[PDB]
């Protein structure tokens, strides 16, 4: 009856999960000849042996990452006997990353993917990887840098990898290499050697690598000025690139040259790169270059271009004007221009991008833009996303609802300096479907005159501002508005009524008023025929309902409401009246993180369509009022993180549709079949983790949990005992509780 892979857990997909279990050896675990995938991430296995994997002879995939880290954390050296991995003749994937080994173990020729990253291997020679002729992917990053230091550098002897006749992917970052290793296999398709000390590159460093698809050589000549992490200052003032370096790479699709101290672009570098789809030139000194270079003239296939964090070569500079060669980038889909810095976004700034047929995404964060003629973005062919967040725009020139993914025309103006919204700032932006103005300082009585041009806007995020919301005409100029986020609206400083506008928003489906400053003149009714989701989290619904009749019907006029979030409202009680006067259409109610101690369960009949009820984080001390009533449609009940010590028999019994019950993080000493009846065997999840279960020998609860074992999350090791003393904090399977 016990889970077959105790103390580990079956993730049905053949994956035996033994991650994070403090194990010091490979578990031996009802046969194991059918397990093909084993994960042992972040245990404490420091020694591997000849017979450790004999019972796992059919493993295909094996992850031993982080068992014995170098330093690392807060010293460790892993020993590995000769035949250890030879036991697994069909092993295809092995991860030995983050382990203190100095030499690569002997390995079965069936291997295809191998990781040796973050180890202490400093030398790769021919003996290192015999005879891995089926190997396709090899990673060995980070064996010699600040987080994992070596004295010297890692050394890849010439031709050492030629025995890997099938190698397609090779990564050797952060290894202090001073040159690209010699005589690499011609089969290579991906080569990453970023963040070493390769200050010079030529056609001599990429010899016969004619099948290269992606090449990453960035971070080899760094400017360490203002670097978040320890950096090694390049000798030269720029990476040395011979102009014919990349010429023979006719299949190059991705090239990365970031953080290379480049000061000039040369058309030569790209002359052979004609399949080039992705190019990263970020963190260089190409400000001036991109204002005038001819380099982009033939980059006709380029889809993605990163120009972010490019600095100025000379203090004397002209206002940003992208080069005319940019007009040739007809395949361009995404352009990243974060962190370049320019005060001014005008009709010439991005002019040469305007006619590009496929340009959908424009990153413009962190540029300190304080003058923006946003109307230019109404003249582009195919824009879907423009990100102007984190700038200094303050007006016209002279979790989140913003999803919105991929499909809608979206602009992000969050984290700017907007104090007042003027309609003129939106001229020519009438196709916009999603807009964010969150985290500005908008202090304004909104009244239907702010957003006139936005006739198509569907999603509006105005969270974290300072809006007056008493005007019933608010947002009346947005006829297609479906989702509106006004969470975290404050009022640091007596007419109309707060939220009166809701009933006039004919298309509104989703509304957030969460965490709002709410004063005495709130509308006593929210009214709508269209709202299906209301988030009223973090307000004072407790004090409001304490007023008596006044707000007794606050949510009732929301006809058709399906989901209501009243979490964090400092509710201590919930009269039947308050429940009966929520809209009868309600399917989901969240009362998470309140102070409810008692809840008459039979009163759920006042909510006939309820399917999901969240009472987590309150202080129900027992499930005992109390029973789920005939004939509730409740499918899921979360009563986790309360202080439930007991449940009345038959509590869940009448809940014919019940599928999920979370009972975790309570103070239960047992879990009892009598609480449920036959309902227990239709449950899809039964969560009983973090309860002080009493692990006595006679303990009835084991039988129940084993019966529904497939349905209890973390059953194998994650369900612990509170008692007795020797089993405190230990798995309920640490001993055999069935023996009595
Ligand atoms: C990398 O090599 C350089 C050579 O100048 C040396 O300063 C450093 O010891 C190496 N880095 C580390 C700490 O691994
Ligand atoms: C692109 O190719 C043309 C010939 O097809 C060549 O004349 C031109 O100079 C190239 N562009 C640049 C600036 O390298
Ligand atoms: C049960 O509730 C707890 C809250 O602490 C959560 O961590 C856990 O993921 C929940 N289980 C399910 C099935 O969501």
DSSP letters, 541-610, are: HHHHHHT-STTTTTTTEETT--EEE-TTS------HHHHHTS-TT--EEE-TTS------GGGGGGSTT-
- Ligand 2 touching residue 267 (CB < 6 A): yes
> Nearest-CA neighbor of 261 among 294, 286, 229?
286
- Residues with beta carbon inside 6 Å of ligand 1? 144-146, 149-150, 153, 176
Task: Please list, residue by residue across 627-650, b when 16 or more beta carbons sit within 10 angstroms of its beta carbon and e when fewer do.
Answer: bbbeebbbbbbbbbbbebbebeee
587 labeled binding residue: no
Q: Compute CA distances 373 → 228, 349, 624, whole Å.
A: 34, 10, 63
- Ligand 2 touching residue 324 (CB < 6 A): no
Asked if 185 and 207 count as a contact pair (C-beta separation under 8 A), the reply is no
> Nearest-CA neighbor of 541 among 590, 482, 501?
590
- Ligand 3 touching residue 612 (CB < 6 A): no
> Nearest-CA neighbor of 444 among 471, 483, 425, 408?
471
CB count within 10 Å of CB 208 equals 11
Token pair belonging to 458: 């569907």
In angstroms, the CA 367 to CA 342 distance is 6
In angstroms, the CA 27 to CA 18 distance is 9
CB count within 10 Å of CB 695 equals 24
Q: Ligand 2 centroid vs 286 CA: distance in angstroms?
A: 21
Task: Please name the residue that has the structure tokens 């052979």.
Answer: 272
- Report the CATH number at residue 674: 3.80.10.10
Q: Ligand 1 centroid vs 73 CA: distance in angstroms?
A: 20
Asked if 108 and 86 count as a contact pair (C-beta separation under 8 A), the reply is yes
Token pair belonging to 159: 């031709």
Method by which this entry was solved: X-ray
Does residue 16 sit in helix, strand or coil? strand
Asked if 675 and 702 count as a contact pair (C-beta separation under 8 A), the reply is no
Which helix (H) or strand (E) segment holds residue 636: the answer is: strand 636-638
- Ligand 3 touching residue 365 (CB < 6 A): no
Could you tell me the resolution of this structure in angstroms? 2.0
Task: Please name the residue that has the structure tokens 């690569």.
Answer: 104
Asked if 388 and 411 count as a contact pair (C-beta separation under 8 A), the reply is yes
Nearest atom of ligand 1 to the alpha carbon of 144: 14
When divided into structural domains, the chain yields a total of: 1
> Nearest-CA neighbor of 118 among 170, 68, 190, 193?
68
- Ligand 2 touching residue 456 (CB < 6 A): no
> Nearest-CA neighbor of 570 among 533, 526, 518?
518
- Ligand 2 touching residue 134 (CB < 6 A): no
Asked if 101 and 121 count as a contact pair (C-beta separation under 8 A), the reply is yes
Cis-peptide into 678, omega within 30 deg: no
Asked if 90 and 59 count as a contact pair (C-beta separation under 8 A), the reply is yes
Residue 620 structural domain: 1-740
Q: Ligand 1 centroid vs 229 CA: distance in angstroms?
A: 15
Q: Ligand 3 centroid vs 43 CA: distance in angstroms?
A: 24
- Ligand 2 touching residue 294 (CB < 6 A): yes
Which helix (H) or strand (E) segment holds residue 527: the answer is: strand 527-528
């Amino acid at each position: 009856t016990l889970p077959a892979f105790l103390p580990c857990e079956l993730k049905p997909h053949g994956l035996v999960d033994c991650n994070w279990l403090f194990l010091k050896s490979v578990p031996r675990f009802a046969s194991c000849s059918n397990i093909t995938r084993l994960s042992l991430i972040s245990n404490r296995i420091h020694h591997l042996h000849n017979s450790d994997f004999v019972h796992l002879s059919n493993l295909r995939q094996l992850n031993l990452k982080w068992n014995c880290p170098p330093t690392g954390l807060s010293s460790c050296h892993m020993t590995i006997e000769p035949r250890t991995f030879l036991a697994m003749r069909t092993l295809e994937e092995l991860n030995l990353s983050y382990n203190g080994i100095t030499t690569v173990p002997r390995l079965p020729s069936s291997l295809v993917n191998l990781s040796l990253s973050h180890t202490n291997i400093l030398v790769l020679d021919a003996n290192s990887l015999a005879g891995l002729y089926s190997l396709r992917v090899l990673f060995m990053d980070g064996n010699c840098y600040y987080k994992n230091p070596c004295t010297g550098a890692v050394k890849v002897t010439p031709g050492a990898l030629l025995g890997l006749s099938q190698l397609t992917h090779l990564s050797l970052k952060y290894n202090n290499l001073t040159k690209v290793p010699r005589q690499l296999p011609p089969s290579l398709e991906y080569l990453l050697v970023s963040y070493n000390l390769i200050v010079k590159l030529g056609p001599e460093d990429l010899a016969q690598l004619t099948s290269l698809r992606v090449l990453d050589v960035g971070g080899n000549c760094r400017r360490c000025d203002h670097a978040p992490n320890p950096c090694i200052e390049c000798g030269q003032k720029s990476l040395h690139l011979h102009p014919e370096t990349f010429h023979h790479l006719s299949h190059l699709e991705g090239l990365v040259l970031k953080d290379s101290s480049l000061h000039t672009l040369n058309s030569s570098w790209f002359q052979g790169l004609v399949q080039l789809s992705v190019l990263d030139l970020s963190e260089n000194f190409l400000y001036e270059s991109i204002t005038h270079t001819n380099a982009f003239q033939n980059l006709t296939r380029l889809r993605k271009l990163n120009l972010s964090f490019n600095y100025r070569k000379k203090v004397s500079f002209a206002r940003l004007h992208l080069a005319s060669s940019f007009k040739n980038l007809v395949s361009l889909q995404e352009l990243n221009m974060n962190g370049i810095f320019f005060r001014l976004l005008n009709k010439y700034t991005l002019r040469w991008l305007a006619d590009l047929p496929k340009l959908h995404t424009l990153h413009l964060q962190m540029n300190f833009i304080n003058q923006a003629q946003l109307s230019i973005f109404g003249t582009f062919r195919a824009l879907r996303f423009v990100d102007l967040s984190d700038n200094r725009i303050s007006g016209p020139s002279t979790n989140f609802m913003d999803r919105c993914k991929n499909f809608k025309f979206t602009m992000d103006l969050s984290r700017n300096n907007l104090v007042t919204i003027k309609p003129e700032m939106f001229v020519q932006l009438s196709r916009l479907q999603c807009l964010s103005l969150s985290h500005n300082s908008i202090a304004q009585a909104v009244n239907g005159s702010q957003f006139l041009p936005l006739t198509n806007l569907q999603v509006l995020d105005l969270s974290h501002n300072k809006l007056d919301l008493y005007h019933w005409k608010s947002f009346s100029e947005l006829p297609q508005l479906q989702a509106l986020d006004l969470s975290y609206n404050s009022q640091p400083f007596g007419i109309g009524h707060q939220f009166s506008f809701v009933t006039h928003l004919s298309m509104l489906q989703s509304l957030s008023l969460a965490h709002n400053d709410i004063h005495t003149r709130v509308s006593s009714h929210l009214n709508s025929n269209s709202v299906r989701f209301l988030d009223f989290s973090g307000n004072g619904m407790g004090r409001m309902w304490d007023e008596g009749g006044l707000y007794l019907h606050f949510f009732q006029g929301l006809s058709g409401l399906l989901k209501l979030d009243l979490s964090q409202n400092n509710l201590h009680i919930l009269r039947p009246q308050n429940l009966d006067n929520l809209p009868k259409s309600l399917k989901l109610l969240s009362l998470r993180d309140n102070y409810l101690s008692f809840f008459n369960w039979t009163s759920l009949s006042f909510l006939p369509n309820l399917e999901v009820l969240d009472l987590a984080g309150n202080q129900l001390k027992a499930l005992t009022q109390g029973t789920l009533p005939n004939g509730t449609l409740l499918q899921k009940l979360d009563v986790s993180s309360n202080s439930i010590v007991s449940v009345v028999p038959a509590f869940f019994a009448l809940a014919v549709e019940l599928k999920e019950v979370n009972l975790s993080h309570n103070i239960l000493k047992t879990v009892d079949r009598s609480w449920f009846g036959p309902i227990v065997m239709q449950l899809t999840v039964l969560d009983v983790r973090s309860n002080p279960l009493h692990c006595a020998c006679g303990a009835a609860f084991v039988d129940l949990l084993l019966e529904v074992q497939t349905k209890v999350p973390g059953l194998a090791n994650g369900v612990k005992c509170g008692s007795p003393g020797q089993l405190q904090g230990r798995s309920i399977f640490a001993q055999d509780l069935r023996l009595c």
